[PDB]
Design an enzyme around this catalytic site. Structure first.
Site, PDB file in Angstrom:
ATOM      1  N   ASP A 141       0.828  -1.196   0.000  1.00 13.96           N
ATOM      2  CA  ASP A 141       0.000   0.000   0.000  1.00 13.96           C
ATOM      3  C   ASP A 141       0.866   1.251   0.000  1.00 13.96           C
ATOM      4  OD1 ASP A 141      -2.595   0.793  -0.268  1.00 13.96           O
ATOM      5  OD2 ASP A 141      -3.032   0.879   1.878  1.00 13.96           O
ATOM      6  N   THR A 162      -3.746   5.123  -4.133  1.00 12.29           N
ATOM      7  CA  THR A 162      -2.850   5.887  -3.275  1.00 12.29           C
ATOM      8  C   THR A 162      -1.459   6.004  -3.880  1.00 12.29           C
ATOM      9  OG1 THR A 162      -4.099   5.108  -1.365  1.00 12.29           O
ATOM     10  CG2 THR A 162      -1.975   6.105  -0.978  1.00 12.29           C
ATOM     11  N   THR A 163      -0.947   4.922  -4.466  1.00 14.07           N
ATOM     12  CA  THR A 163       0.359   4.993  -5.111  1.00 14.07           C
ATOM     13  C   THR A 163       0.307   5.851  -6.368  1.00 14.07           C
ATOM     14  OG1 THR A 163       0.773   2.765  -4.274  1.00 14.07           O
ATOM     15  CG2 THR A 163       2.297   3.636  -5.908  1.00 14.07           C
ATOM     16  N   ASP A 208      -8.535  -2.315   0.771  1.00 15.62           N
ATOM     17  CA  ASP A 208      -8.659  -1.661  -0.525  1.00 15.62           C
ATOM     18  C   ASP A 208      -9.804  -2.258  -1.329  1.00 15.62           C
ATOM     19  OD1 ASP A 208      -6.442  -0.378   0.395  1.00 15.62           O
ATOM     20  OD2 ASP A 208      -5.108  -0.995  -1.230  1.00 15.62           O
TER      21      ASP A 208
HETATM   22  N1  LIG Z   1      -5.115  -7.036 -14.532  1.00 23.57           N
HETATM   23  C1  LIG Z   1      -4.543  -5.847 -14.825  1.00 23.57           C
HETATM   24  N2  LIG Z   1      -4.029  -5.599 -16.045  1.00 23.57           N
HETATM   25  C2  LIG Z   1      -3.459  -4.419 -16.344  1.00 23.57           C
HETATM   26  N3  LIG Z   1      -3.350  -3.403 -15.476  1.00 23.57           N
HETATM   27  C3  LIG Z   1      -3.826  -3.517 -14.218  1.00 23.57           C
HETATM   28  C4  LIG Z   1      -4.461  -4.774 -13.814  1.00 23.57           C
HETATM   29  N4  LIG Z   1      -4.833  -4.622 -12.534  1.00 23.57           N
HETATM   30  C5  LIG Z   1      -4.468  -3.376 -12.148  1.00 23.57           C
HETATM   31  N5  LIG Z   1      -3.866  -2.722 -13.153  1.00 23.57           N
HETATM   32  C6  LIG Z   1      -3.342  -1.343 -13.085  1.00 23.57           C
HETATM   33  O1  LIG Z   1      -2.254  -1.308 -12.170  1.00 23.57           O
HETATM   34  C7  LIG Z   1      -2.379  -0.215 -11.267  1.00 23.57           C
HETATM   35  C8  LIG Z   1      -2.111  -0.719  -9.860  1.00 23.57           C
HETATM   36  O2  LIG Z   1      -2.593   0.228  -8.924  1.00 23.57           O
HETATM   37  P1  LIG Z   1      -2.265   0.037  -7.371  1.00 23.57           P
HETATM   38  O3  LIG Z   1      -0.811   0.363  -7.184  1.00 23.57           O
HETATM   39  O4  LIG Z   1      -2.786  -1.298  -6.909  1.00 23.57           O
HETATM   40  O5  LIG Z   1      -3.194   1.175  -6.728  1.00 23.57           O
HETATM   41  P2  LIG Z   1      -2.674   2.145  -5.564  1.00 23.57           P
HETATM   42  O6  LIG Z   1      -2.199   3.349  -6.333  1.00 23.57           O
HETATM   43  O7  LIG Z   1      -3.898   2.362  -4.717  1.00 23.57           O
HETATM   44  O8  LIG Z   1      -1.596   1.367  -4.861  1.00 23.57           O
HETATM   45  C9  LIG Z   1      -3.783   0.333 -11.407  1.00 23.57           C
HETATM   46  O9  LIG Z   1      -3.711   1.715 -11.757  1.00 23.57           O
HETATM   47  C10 LIG Z   1      -4.419  -0.429 -12.546  1.00 23.57           C
HETATM   48  O10 LIG Z   1      -4.824   0.490 -13.560  1.00 23.57           O
HETATM   49 MG   LIG Z   2      -4.390  -0.212  -5.962  1.00 20.34          MG
END
Ligand SMILES: Nc1ncnc2c1ncn2[C@@H]1O[C@H](COP(=O)(O)OP(=O)(O)O)[C@@H](O)[C@H]1O
Ligand SMILES: [Mg+2]
Ligand SMILES: Nc1ncnc2c1ncn2[C@@H]1O[C@H](COP(=O)(O)OP(=O)(O)O)[C@@H](O)[C@H]1O
Ligand SMILES: Nc1ncnc2c1ncn2[C@@H]1O[C@H](COP(=O)(O)OP(=O)(O)O)[C@@H](O)[C@H]1O
Ligand SMILES: [Mg+2]
Ligand SMILES: [Mg+2]
Lengths: 536, 139, 52, 525, 260, 76
Positions: free
Chosen positions: A56, A89-90, A393
Site C-alpha cells: 500500500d 494511493t500509489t 482496498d
Molecule cells: N489485470 C490488470 N491488467 C493491467 N493493469 C492492471 C491490472 N490490474 C491493475 N492494473 C493497473 O495497475 C495499477 C495498480 O494500482 P495500485 O498500485 O494497486 O493502486 P494504488 O495506487 O492504490 O496502490 C492500477 O492503476 C491499474 O490500472
Molecule cells: Mg491499488
C-alpha cells in the site's frame, strides 16, 4: 550573514524550486516500484526489528521518516486519498511528483508559474469532464460480474492477487451483506463494519466469511457453556461488579449492628440486577466493562455465556445486527430499575470457536439484520497483516462502485486517452497556457510508463502502441471501441481492458487528478524558503 | 537524550471516572513556577518568570488578578492557613517574602532578612516557614 | 504564505528597524487588512532615499 | 545482504549500478553545466573562485572556471575533460561544449528513466553527430578569392566575435586589429611562444600596445648601469649565452703555484681572460649586449665606458623572441662574432612603463614575432585580458589555417536542429525520438543567450524556428535589438571547426556517460 | 494562491460581509461575526458559506443525527447528581439509605430531563463544565430515550456567537428553562465530510441575526491556512469599503500618479 | 556606512578599525596617559621612577630622565 539578519538559512529562485522537485521526486521513487500487477512489496524495519511487509502506498509513507516540507506534502497527499477513496494511493503520489517535475521544466524556461498553474487547473477540469463523458461504463450493463472484476483488479499487485478468484467473492458478498438504506432511500454501504480478524495457521484458501459477527473475545469463566443455539443477546454498557458508593457518599457507622447489613447490600445490588437480566431469558450477556468473580457465578449457574471487556464499536455492530439495544443503565422512566424482553437481540448460534491455538466468539446468523466478518489465515503475522490492508482496498473499491454506478477501464487506458485529448485540446486555449496543458497531458503517461517498466518490458513501444490506438479512437468516429484499450502486463501488448475485466471506480481517477493537481500547485507556488534554526 | 520524558502522563487515559477534568489552563505559557491549587478549588495561583503572581478561576478560566510588585521572579508561593481570603506569601529571587490579599490586591506585609524557595504556613497561620520563621503578629 | 504580515511575523528579524517594519505591517493589517506588503515596500524605499 | 564471513572486496567499497546511477550521473553533469551557464554570450558574466590559499581568480572562460572547480564526481569530470580538449584543439567554445553535452544528457534522461537501452541512445547520438558535422561542412561559407583585404577582414571579424564576450569587449575592434596584426607576422608554424604577452599594472585598456619587435623588463642591473646610454638609432645586438663575470675557470679547476710571480701572473691571467671576452664583444661592433647568463659589475662598467648597453639574466623566451625579431644567433662563445650572428633593429630604447622599466626593440623589418603589453588596474584584470587575447589568437590561427565560417549567435545550432528534425521525421520511430531529442538539445545555445541577455527566450526561439523553416540560414539572436537578425550580415562569424569540434566532443562525452552502468569506488589508501 | 477559485470566493466574501451588517447604517464591520472553520480534505472548490451555525463538537447520542423542525436549547448547568457549592457529603448509616440514595438520585436526574423535554426541546447544547460532570451517563440515557439530540462540551467563548446565531437564550438554572428561551431552527443534522471528519450544521433559523459561517476545505493543511488568510484579506477589503466609501484604480496607477 | 559597522565584514580575523570619535578618544587617552606618567618628574623638585623589568633579566632601573622612562615601557 548579510543585511537581512535572520537566524536561519534562506534559499531563493531556482535553488529552492529544484530542491522542492527533488523532494517530490524522492518520495515517488520510493513507491514507484510497487505499482501495477507486476509490482513488488517492501519490507519496513522499524529500528527495533519490527517488520512491515506492505504494498500500500499510504502505509509506506506513513511509516517513513520524512523531513523535507515538500515531501511531507506528498506523504500527507497519499493519506488523504486513502481516507476519501481508499485506492489509487500509489498513483496519486506518482502523478503529483510527475506533474511538479514537468511544471518546473516550464518554469526554468521563463514561463511564469501563474501561467503553469492556470494551465494545470484548466487541464484538470477538462480531464474530469472528458472522463465523465467518454470513459465511464454504467455498471447496470454488467451486473454482478462488474463488482467481481472491480474487486479482482484492486487485488492485483497484492498478496491476495493470484488467489483473487476466491477472494473477490468474499469481498462482494461481505459488502452486500452490510448494505442498508437510509432516509431519502439512498443505499449506503458502511464498509469497515465488516470486522476483520487475523489469525495465522492454515492456507489463504481457508479464509472464512462469517455470516454473522466474529468477536476477538472469550467467555469470562470456564464454567459457562461455550455454545448457545437460540441466543438471546443482551448488550450492556456498564460493569457488573460489587456496588461502591460515589465520591459524594460516605458510610459512617454509629450503631455497630448496621455494619453487616450494609456490606451485604454492596453485593446484593449487583445480584439483583443480574437476576432481572437473567429472568427475561437472556442467554448471552455482552458488556463493555469488567465482571467480578462473584458475578460470573450467576451466569455459570444459569447456563449463560458472559463476555466482558467487549469493544464499544464491536458491541454497537452486534446490537445493530442482532436487534438488541445498548443499555448503559437499568432505569426506566418510572424511576424503577427494570429490564425488558424487547431489549434482547437474537441469533441462530453463538460458538466459542478455536482458531490456531486461540479462541474467539462467533455470533452466527443474527436476525433483523445481516452482518459479516472475515477471518484471514496466513503463514505468519507479517503476511496476515498485509492481507488485511489488501482486503481493505478491495472493500473500499467495491463500496465506490456500488455507490457510484460508473467504472473506468484500467491499465493506463484513462491516462492514454487523456494524453491524446488534452494535447489536442491545448492548441485551442490561449497561447502561454498551451505549454502548461500539454505538459499536464504528458505527465499523465507516467502511469502506463511505470506499469511497463515494472514488468521489464519495452515501455517506449507499449506506450506508443497504446497511444496510437487511442489517437485512432479520437480522430475516427467509427473506431470508438478503442477507448477501452489498456495494457496487458502478462504478455506485454495492448488489450481491450473493458472486455478483459480490468475496471476501476470512476472516483479513483477523478479524485486522484484533483488532489494531485492541488498538491502540485501548492509546491509550484513557492519560490523562497526561510528555515529558522532551532532555538535549542 | 535530554528529554526522555515526552511520553509523560499527558495521555491521562482512564475510564472517565470524573477525574478527567484537569483543566490544564497553560494559557500564559512561559514558566509555571508554582501551579498550587487553592484550598478552595475555585481558584488557581500561578507564578511566571516575569515576577507576577497570577490568580485564575477554574470554572470561568479567566485571569482574576495579576499580582505584581516582586523585585525578581517569584520562585515559590504558598496558600492561606485554611482560606482566610487566601492571604498568600510569595518567595522569589529578590530575597523578599511578601503577603498579598485579593480583597484589596496589595502587598499587605513584607519581610527582608534572609532566594526563598520553601515557604510553608504554620498550622495556626500566625507564622510561616521561610526556607527561617516570620511572625505575622509582629512583622 | 503570500501575506506580508504573516511573512514578516514568521521570520524572526533581529535588527530593530526590521522589528519596527514588522510592527508597521501589523498596524496596516489591523487598520486596512490589505496592502500589507506595499506599506513595507514603501517604507523601505523611503529610507533608501533617506540614505542619499 | 547476509554478512559473508570473508567479504569479496575491501571494506568500504561503494558500488552503485542500474538506472539510478545513470540518472545521478546526468544530474551531476547538469550541476557542472549550470556553473558556467551565465558566462555565455555578449551579455555573459564573470565568475570569481577563491582557492584554499585565498588567491582569487576571475574569468569568463569556461575551461578556466571548470579547472578551478575541484570536481570529484567521476561522471562530471568528463565535462571538464572535454572543455580542456576543446580549449586545446580550438581555444574557443569551452562553454558551448559543456552546455551541449549536459543538454544532450538532460534530453535523453526521460528515455533512460523508462528503461530504454543505452546502446540505442549512443547509436542515435553518433548518427546525429555525423549528420550535423557533414551539414556544417556543407553549408559553411568559404571565400575562394585569396584576397588579402578580404582575408584580413574575415580574420578581424572572427576575432571580434570571439572577443565580444569579455571585459575587453568595449575595445574589441582595437584588440581584434592588434591580434590580427600580431598573428599575421608569424611565419609558418604560428607558435604561441613567438607572441610575447607582458602585463604591466596601471593604465587604461586603450593604453595597451603591440610592438613590432620584442620588449622585456629590465633585469637586475648592476652598479654603473645608469651611466650607459639608453637610446640607439641603429644598434647591433650581440645575443649571447655567456657569463661575463670574474669567476673560477672551472668548478674542478685547481691552481698550484710556488712563486709570487706566478701568483701575480695567475691574477692577471684571470683579468685578461675577462677583458679578452669583453674586447671581442666590443670589437664585434655591437652596441647592445644581452646575455642569458649573468653579466657582472665589471663588465657593466666596461660597457658603460664604451657607451654600450648590457643586460644579463634575460629570460630564454625573451632571447628567442629577440633572435626572431632582429635576426641574429645566440652565441655561447664569443670567439667568432661575425656580422651575420649579430642582431639589428632600427631603434632600441629603455622607457618608463607604469612604474616599471622596459627595454624596447622596435623597427624590425624582418620581424617574425611580437609582444603584447597589457595595461590594467589589477592583476586579475590583466590576467583576464590575457585569456581573452589568447582566445582571439587561437581563433585567428585556426582561421588562417582554413577560412570557413558559420554565423554565430545560435544561427548554426538552429539550422542544424531544423535539419536534424527534418531528417528524424523520415525514420522508423525508435531512432526518431532520440534524433528529435538531439535536435531539441541543439537549441540550448540561443536559449541561453536570450536568458543571459534577459529576453523572453521562448518568443525568440519561436521566431528563430519560424524563420529557419520558412527560409534563411544565418538568422540568430540579436542581443542589442531585443530580436533576431541575419547574423551573417551582422558579422557574427566563427570558424566552422569551432562548432564541429564542439559537437564532436559533446557527443563523445554524452555517449561515454551513457555507456556507463556501474560506478565502483575503492577506499582511499 | 486562491486565484482560480476567485470566481467562487469573491461572491462568497461579499455575501458574508453583507449578511453580517446593515448596509444603510453600518459604519464598521466586526469580523468576529464571521466564523471560519477549517476542515481537511476535499478541494477549495468545496468551500461553503453556511447561513446557520457550524459546530465541530460530536453528538453524544448514537442513532439520532438529524432533527427537523429543531428546538435548540442552550444549558449552562450540569445534568448530574446534585452538588452544592459548599462542601457536601451524604452520610449513610443504614442499608436502606443506600438504595434510597440511588433511587433519589435517579429521580432527580429524571425530573431534570422531564422538565427539559416538557418545553418541546429536541436538540440540546450543554456548555463545557468543570468541577462537575456536565452530562451524566444516566442523564444521557434518559435524554436518548426521550429522542433528544445532545451536544456537550460547548466552549464558553462560543456562547455569545451561538446565541447571536440561532437566537437561543442561555439557561443557567432549570427553573428558568422554558419554551420561550429555545431557538427554533429548520434543520439540525450532523454531516460527514467523506471520511475526513464530521460537522454539525444548523441551517435555517427563525431569527438569523447578523452572523454567517465559512467552511474552508483543501487537500492539505498548508493550502487551507493560506486560503483562510486570503479569505480574511477579502473580508478586510470589503470592510475597508464599508468604512470609507471611496474606490481607486489599481495596478500601480495611484503610485505612478503620486510620483508624478 | 563604516567598514566595521557593515552587514558584510571586510577584515581578516583580529583586524579592527576605529572611526572618528573612537580614534580621537584612544589617541587622546594615550597621549594624556603618557604626559601624566612622565610629569611629576619635572623641575627642580621632581621625583624619580622605578623601572622594574618583568623580563628574564629583571633589570632594576631608577631614573629621572623622561626619554629613558618612555623607552623602557611596553607601549601599545
Ligand atoms: N489485470 C490488470 N491488467 C493491467 N493493469 C492492471 C491490472 N490490474 C491493475 N492494473 C493497473 O495497475 C495499477 C495498480 O494500482 P495500485 O498500485 O494497486 O493502486 P494504488 O495506487 O492504490 O496502490 C492500477 O492503476 C491499474 O490500472
Ligand atoms: Mg491499488
Ligand atoms: N490583476 C491585477 N492587475 C494589476 N495589478 C494588480 C492586480 N491584482 C493586484 N494588483 C496590484 O498588486 C498589488 C499588491 O496586492 P496584493 O499582493 O494582493 O496585496 P498587498 O498589497 O498586501 O501585497 C496591489 O497594489 C494591486 O494594485
Ligand atoms: N555579437 C554577438 N551576437 C550574438 N551572439 C554572439 C555575439 N558574439 C558572440 N556570440 C555568441 O556567444 C557564444 C559564446 O561565445 P563566448 O562566450 O565568447 O565563448 P564560448 O563559446 O567559449 O562561451 C557563441 O556561440 C557566439 O555565437
Ligand atoms: Mg492585496
Ligand atoms: Mg568565445
Amino acid at each position: 550573514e548579510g543585511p537581512l539578519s535572520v537566524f536561519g538559512d534562506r534559499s531563493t529562485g531556482e535553488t529552492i524550486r529544484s530542491q522542492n522537485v527533488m523532494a517530490a521526486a524522492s518520495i515517488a521513487n520510493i513507491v514507484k516500484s510497487s505499482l501495477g500487477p507486476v509490482g513488488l512489496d517492501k519490507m519496513l524495519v522499524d529500528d527495533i526489528g519490527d517488520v512491515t511487509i506492505t504494498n500500500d502506498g499510504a502505509t509506506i509513507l506513513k511509516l517513513l521518516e520524512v523531513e523535507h516540507p515538500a515531501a511531507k506534502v506528498l506523504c500527507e497527499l497519499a493519506d488523504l486519498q486513502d481516507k476519501e477513496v481508499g485506492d489509487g494511493t500509489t498513483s496519486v503520489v506518482i502523478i503529483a511528483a510527475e506533474l511538479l517535475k514537468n511544471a518546473d521544466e516550464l518554469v526554468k524556461q521563463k514561463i511564469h508559474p501563474t501561467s503553469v498553474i492556470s494551465g494545470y487547473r484548466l487541464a484538470c477540469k477538462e480531464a474530469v469532464r472528458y472522463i465523465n463523458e467518454n470513459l465511464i461504463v454504467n455498471t447496470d450493463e454488467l451486473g454482478r460480474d462488474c463488482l467481481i472484476n472491480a474487486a479482482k483488479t484492486s487485488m492485483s499487485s497484492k498478496i491476495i492477487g493470484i488467489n483473487g478468484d476466491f477472494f473477490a467473492n468474499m469481498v462482494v458478498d461481505a459488502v452486500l451483506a452490510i448494505k442498508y438504506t437510509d432516509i431519502r432511500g439512498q443505499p449506503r454501504y458502511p464498509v469497515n463494519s465488516v470486522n476483520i480478524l487475523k489469525a495465522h495457521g492454515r492456507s489463504q484458501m481457508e479464509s472464512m466469511l462469517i455470516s454473522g459477527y466474529a468477536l476477538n473475545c472469550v467467555v469470562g469463566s470456564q464454567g459457562m457453556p461455550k455454545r448457545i443455539v437460540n441466543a438471546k443477546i443482551a448488550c450492556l454498557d456498564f460493569s457488573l461488579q460489587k456496588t461502591k458508593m460515589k465520591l459524594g457518599v460516605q458510610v459512617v457507622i454509629t450503631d455497630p449492628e448496621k455494619l453487616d447489613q450494609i456490606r451485604q447490600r454492596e453485593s446484593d445490588i449487583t445480584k439483583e440486577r443480574i437476576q432481572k437480566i437473567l429472568a427475561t431469558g437472556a442467554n448471552v450477556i455482552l458488556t463493555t466493562g469488567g465482571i467480578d468473580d462473584m458475578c460470573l457465578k450467576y451466569f455459570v449457574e444459569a447456563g449463560a455465556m458472559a463476555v466482558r471487556r467487549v469493544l464499544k464499536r464491536d458491541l454497537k455492530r452486534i446490537a445493530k445486527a442482532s436487534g438488541a439495544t445498548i443499555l448503559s443503565t437499568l432505569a426506566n422512566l418510572e424511576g424503577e430499575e427494570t429490564f425488558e424482553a424487547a431489549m434482547l437481540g437474537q441469533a441462530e448460534e453463538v460458538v466459542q470457536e478455536r482458531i490456531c491455538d486461540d479462541e474467539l466468539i462467533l455470533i452466527k446468523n443474527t436476525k433483523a439484520r445481516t452482518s459479516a466478518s472475515i477471518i484471514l489465515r496466513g503463514a505468519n503475522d507479517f503476511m496476515c497483516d498485509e492481507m488485511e490492508r489488501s482486503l481493505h482496498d478491495a472493500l473500499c473499491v467495491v463500496k465506490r462502485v456500488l455507490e457510484s454506478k460508473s467504472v473506468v477501464p484500467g491499465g493506463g487506458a484513462v491516462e492514454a486517452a487523456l494524453s491524446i485529448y488534452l494535447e489536442n485540446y491545448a492548441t485551442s486555449m490561449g497561447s502561454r497556457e498551451q505549454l502548461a496543458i500539454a505538459e499536464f497531458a504528458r505527465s499523465l503517461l507516467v502511469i502506463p510508463n511505470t506499469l511497463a517498466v515494472n514488468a521489464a518490458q519495452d515501455s517506449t513501444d507499449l506506450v506508443a502502441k497504446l497511444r496510437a490506438f487511442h489517437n485512432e479512437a479520437q480522430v475516427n468516429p467509427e473506431r470508438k471501441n478503442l477507448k477501452w484499450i489498456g495494457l496487458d502486463l502478462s504478455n506485454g501488448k495492448p488489450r481491450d481492458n473493458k472486455q478483459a475485466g480490468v475496471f476501476e471506480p470512476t472516483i479513483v481517477k477523478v479524485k486522484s487528478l484533483k488532489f494531485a493537481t492541488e498538491a502540485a500547485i501548492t509546491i509550484l507556488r513557492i519560490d523562497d524558503l526561510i528555515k529558522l534554526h532551532p532555538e535549542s | 537524550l535530554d528529554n526522555k520524558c515526552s511520553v509523560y502522563p499527558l495521555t491521562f487515559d482512564k475510564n472517565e471516572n470524573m477525574a478527567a477534568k484537569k483543566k490544564s489552563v497553560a494559557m500564559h505559557t512561559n514558566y509555571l513556577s508554582a501551579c498550587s491549587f487553592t484550598n478552595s478549588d475555585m481558584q488557581i495561583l500561578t507564578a511566571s518568570g516575569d515576577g507576577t503572581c497570577a490568580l485564575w478561576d477554574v470554572e470561568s478560566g479567566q485571569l482574576l488578578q495579576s499580582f505584581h510588585g516582586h523585585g525578581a521572579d517569584v520562585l515559590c508561593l504558598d496558600l492561606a492557613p485554611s482560606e482566610t481570603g487566601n492571604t498568600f506569601v510569595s518567595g522569589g529571587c529578590d530575597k523578599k517574602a511578601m503577603v498579598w490579599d485579593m480583597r484589596s490586591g496589595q502587598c499587605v506585609q513584607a519581610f527582608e532578612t534572609h532566594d526563598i524557595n520553601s515557604v510553608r504556613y504554620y498550622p495556626s497561620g500566625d507564622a510561616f516557614a521561610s526556607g527561617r520563621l516570620y511572625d505575622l503578629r509582629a512583622d | 504564505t503570500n501575506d506580508g504580515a504573516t511573512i514578516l511575523k514568521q521570520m524572526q528579524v533581529l535588527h530593530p528597524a526590521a522589528r519596527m517594519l514588522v510592527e508597521l505591517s501589523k498596524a496596516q493589517d489591523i487598520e486596512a487588512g490589505d496592502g500589507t506588503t506595499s506599506v513595507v515596500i514603501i517604507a523601505g524605499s523611503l529610507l533608501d532615499s533617506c540614505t542619499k | 545482504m547476509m554478512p559473508t564471513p570473508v567479504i569479496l572486496l575491501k571494506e568500504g567499497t561503494d558500488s552503485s549500478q542500474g538506472i539510478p546511477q545513470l540518472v545521478s550521473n546526468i544530474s551531476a553533469c547538469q550541476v557542472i553545466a549550470e556553473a558556467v551557464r551565465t558566462t555565455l554570450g555578449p551579455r555573459g558574466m564573470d565568475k570569481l573562485i577563491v582557492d584554499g590559499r585565498g588567491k582569487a581568480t576571475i574569468s569568463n572562460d569556461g575551461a578556466t572556471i571548470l579547472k578551478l572547480l575541484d570536481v570529484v564526481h567521476p561522471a562530471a569530470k568528463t565535462l571538464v575533460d572535454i572543455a580542456k580538449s576543446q580549449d586545446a584543439e580550438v581555444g574557443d567554445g569551452t562553454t558551448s561544449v559543456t552546455l551541449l553535452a549536459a543538454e544532450f544528457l538532460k534530453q535523453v534522461k526521460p528515455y533512460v528513466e523508462e528503461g530504454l537501452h543505452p546502446q540505442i541512445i549512443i547509436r542515435a547520438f553518433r548518427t546525429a553527430t555525423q549528420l550535423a558535422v557533414n551539414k556544417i561542412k556543407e553549408i559553411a561559407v568559404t571565400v575562394k578569392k585569396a584576397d588579402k583585404v578580404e582575408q584580413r577582414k574575415l580574420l578581424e571579424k572572427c576575432a571580434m566575435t570571439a572577443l565580444s564576450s569579455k571585459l575587453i569587449s568595449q575595445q574589441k575592434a582595437f584588440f581584434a586589429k592588434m591580434v590580427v596584426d600580431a598573428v599575421m607576422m608569424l611565419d609558418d608554424l604560428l607558435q604561441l611562444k613567438m607572441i610575447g604577452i607582458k602585463k604591466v599594472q596601471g593604465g587604461a585598456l586603450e593604453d595597451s600596445q603591440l610592438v613590432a619587435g620584442v620588449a622585456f623588463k629590465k633585469t637586475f642591473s648592476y652598479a654603473g648601469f645608469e651611466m650607459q646610454p639608453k637610446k640607439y638609432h641603429n644598434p647591433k645586438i650581440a645575443l649571447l649565452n655567456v657569463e661575463l663575470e670574474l669567476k673560477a675557470e672551472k668548478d674542478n679547476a685547481e691552481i698550484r703555484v710556488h712563486t709570487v710571480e706566478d701568483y701575480q701572473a695567475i691574477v692577471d691571467a684571470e683579468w685578461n681572460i675577462l677583458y679578452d671576452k669583453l674586447e671581442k664583444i666590443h670589437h664585434s661592433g655591437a652596441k647592445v649586449v644581452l646575455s642569458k647568463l649573468p653579466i657582472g659589475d665589471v663588465a657593466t662598467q666596461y660597457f658603460a665606458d664604451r657607451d654600450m648597453f648590457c643586460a644579463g639574466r634575460v629570460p630564454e623566451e625573451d632571447l628567442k623572441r629577440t633572435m626572431m625579431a632582429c635576426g641574429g644567433s645566440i652565441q655561447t662563445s664569443v670567439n667568432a662574432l661575425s656580422a651575420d650572428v649579430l642582431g639589428r633593429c632600427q631603434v632600441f630604447e629603455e622607457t618608463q612603463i607604469g612604474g616599471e622599466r622596459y627595454n624596447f626593440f622596435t623597427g624590425c623589418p624582418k620581424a617574425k614575432t611580437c609582444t603584447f603589453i597589457l595595461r590594467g588596474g589589477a592583476e586579475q584584470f590583466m590576467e583576464e585580458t590575457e585569456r581573452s587575447l589568447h582566445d582571439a589568437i587561437m581563433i585567428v590561427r585556426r582561421a588562417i589555417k582554413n577560412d570557413s565560417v558559420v554565423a554565430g549567435g545560435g544561427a548554426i545550432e538552429m539550422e542544424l536542429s531544423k535539419y536534424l528534425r527534418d531528417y528524424s521525421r523520415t525514420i522508423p520511430g525508435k531512432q526518431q525520438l532520440l534524433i528529435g531529442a538531439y535536435a531539441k538539445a541543439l537549441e540550448i545555445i540561443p536559449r541561453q543567450l536570450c536568458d543571459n541577455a534577459g529576453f523572453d527566450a521562448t518568443n525568440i526561439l519561436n521566431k528563430l524556428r519560424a524563420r529557419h523553416a520558412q527560409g534563411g540560414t544565418w538568422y540568430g539572436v540579436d542581443i542589442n535589438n531585443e530580436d533576431i537578425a541575419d547574423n551573417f550580415e551582422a558579422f557574427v562569424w566563427e570558424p566552422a571547426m569551432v562548432r564541429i569540434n564542439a559537437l564532436t566532443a559533446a557527443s563523445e562525452a554524452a555517449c561515454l556517460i551513457v555507456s556507463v552502468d556501474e560506478t565502483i569506488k575503492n577506499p582511499r589508501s | 494562491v486562491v486565484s482560480q477559485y476567485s470566481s467562487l470566493l469573491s461572491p462568497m466574501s461579499v455575501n458574508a460581509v453583507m449578511k453580517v451588517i446593515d448596509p444603510a447604517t453600518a459604519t464598521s464591520v466586526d469580523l468576529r461575526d464571521i466564523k471560519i472553520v477549517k476542515k481537511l480534505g476535499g478541494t477549495i472548490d468545496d468551500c461553503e458559506l453556511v447561513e446557520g451555525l457550524v459546530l465541530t463538537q460530536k453528538v453524544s447520542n448514537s442513532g439520532i443525527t438529524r432533527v427537523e423542525k429543531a428546538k435548540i436549547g442552550l444549558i449552562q448547568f450540569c445534568l448530574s447528581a446534585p452538588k452544592t457549592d459548599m462542601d457536601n457529603q451524604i452520610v449513610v448509616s443504614d442499608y436502606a439509605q443506600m438504595d434510597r440514595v440511588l433511587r433519589e438520585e435517579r429521580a432527580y436526574i429524571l425530573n431534570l430531563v422531564k422538565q427539559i423535554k416538557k418545553t418541546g426541546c429536541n436538540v440540546l447544547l450543554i456548555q463545557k463544565s468543570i468541577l462537575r460532570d456536565a452530562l451524566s451517563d444516566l442523564a444521557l440515557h434518559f435524554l436518548n430515550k426521550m429522542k433528544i439530540m445532545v451536544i456537550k462540551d460547548i466552549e464558553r467563548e462560543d456562547i455569545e456567537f451561538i446565541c447571536k446565531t440561532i437566537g437561543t437564550k442561555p439557561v443557567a438554572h432549570i427553573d428558568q428553562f422554558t419554551a420561550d428561551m429555545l431557538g427554533s431552527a429548520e434543520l439540525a443534522e450532523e454531516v460527514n465530510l467523506n471520511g475526513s471528519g464530521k460537522l454539525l450544521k444548523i441551517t435555517g433559523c427563525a431569527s438569523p441575526g447578523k452572523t454567517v459561517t465559512i467552511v474552508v476545505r483543501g487537500s492539505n493543511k498548508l493550502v487551507i491556512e493560506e486560503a483562510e488568510r486570503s479569505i480574511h484579506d477579502a473580508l478586510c477589503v470589503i470592510r475597508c469599503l464599508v468604512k470609507k466609501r471611496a474606490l481607486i484604480a489599481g495596478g500601480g496607477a495611484p503610485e505612478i500618479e503620486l510620483a508624478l | 556606512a563604516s567598514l566595521s559597522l557593515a552587514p558584510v565584514n571586510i577584515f581578516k580575523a583580529g583586524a579592527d578599525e576605529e572611526r572618528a570619535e573612537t580614534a580621537r578618544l584612544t589617541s587622546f587617552i594615550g597621549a594624556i596617559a603618557i604626559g601624566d606618567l612622565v610629569k611629576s618628574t619635572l623641575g627642580p623638585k621632581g621625583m624619580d621612577k622605578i623601572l622594574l623589568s618583568s623580563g628574564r633579566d629583571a633589570s632594576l632601573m631608577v631614573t629621572n630622565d623622561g626619554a629613558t622612562i618612555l623607552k623602557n615601557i611596553g607601549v601599545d
